[PDB]
Amino acid sequence: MGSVKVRFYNNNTLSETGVIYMRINVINTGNAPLDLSDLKLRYYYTIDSESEQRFNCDWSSIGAHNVTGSFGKVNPSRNGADTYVEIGFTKEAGMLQPGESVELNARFSKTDNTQYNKADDYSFNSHYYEYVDWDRITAYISGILKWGREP
Ligand SMILES: [Ca+2]
Numbered sequence: 581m582g583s584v585k586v587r588f589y590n591n592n593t594l595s596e597t598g599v600i601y602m603r604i605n606v607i608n609t610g611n612a613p614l615d616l617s618d619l620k621l622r623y624y625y626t627i628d629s630e631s632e633q634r635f636n637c638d639w640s641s642i643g644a645h646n647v648t649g650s651f652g653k654v655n656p657s658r659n660g661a662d663t664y665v666e667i668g669f670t671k672e673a674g675m676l677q678p679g680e681s682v683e684l685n686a687r688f689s690k691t692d693n694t695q696y697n698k699a700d701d702y703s704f705n706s707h708y709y710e711y712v713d714w715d716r717i718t719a720y721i722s723g724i725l726k727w728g729r730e731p
Contacts, residue, residue: 581618581721583610586728588714590705596695599687600625604667605711606719607681614676616642616669620720624654624661624731625701631690635665640684646673647684654731660702661731702731 589603602623608614627633635649648668654661665688676682690696698704703716718728 581724582608582612582614582726584614584619584719584721584726585609586621586714586717586719587711588703588705588717589711590708592698592704592708594699596697598693598695599689600696600698600701601685601687602665602667603683603685603711604717605681605683606676608676608678611678613678614721616646616673616676616682617671618722619669619682620723621667622652622664622718622720623667623703624664624716624718625703626660626697627663627690628697629690629692629694631692631694633665633688634691635667635686635688637667637684637686641682642669642673642684644684646670647686649686649688658702658731660700660704664703 587605637644637647640647650666715728719726
């Protein structure tokens with residue numbers, strides 16, 4: 581359904597924390613317009629202790645309330661990946677023309693307030709404070725894998 585690239589800006593600490601932050605910029609690198617409602621991203625990790633989780637988007641270029649989050653299990657589990665968060669967009673989020681990008685700042689946490697070990701997560705990188713192309717967050721358009729490497 582088109583072409584995209586995912587850039588990730590890691591502002592997390594290595595220390596165990598109750599929150600994992602995700603700052604993501606997705607650029608339309610193809611020749612076709614993209615409706616953001618068709619775009620899903622997945623960030624894969626080990627949950628570390630079992631708890632209900634909550635997703636929040638604090639800011640997006642298309643409006644924080646137009647960003648959705650949900651969770652899934654990786655089964656059978658893989659190295660660094662027993663869980664993922666899937667970030668999506670509402671019907672009202674709009675289009676990206678070729679060359680345009682969407683940016684969002686989001687996070688997730690465990691509602692029992694237990695901590696994550698981030699360092700072992702499949703999608704966690706080691707490049708801090710700089711947006712880089714990051715192939716361990718996958719992107720799908722209309723269900724079709726367009727960017728990245730599934731665990
Ligand atoms: Ca973990």
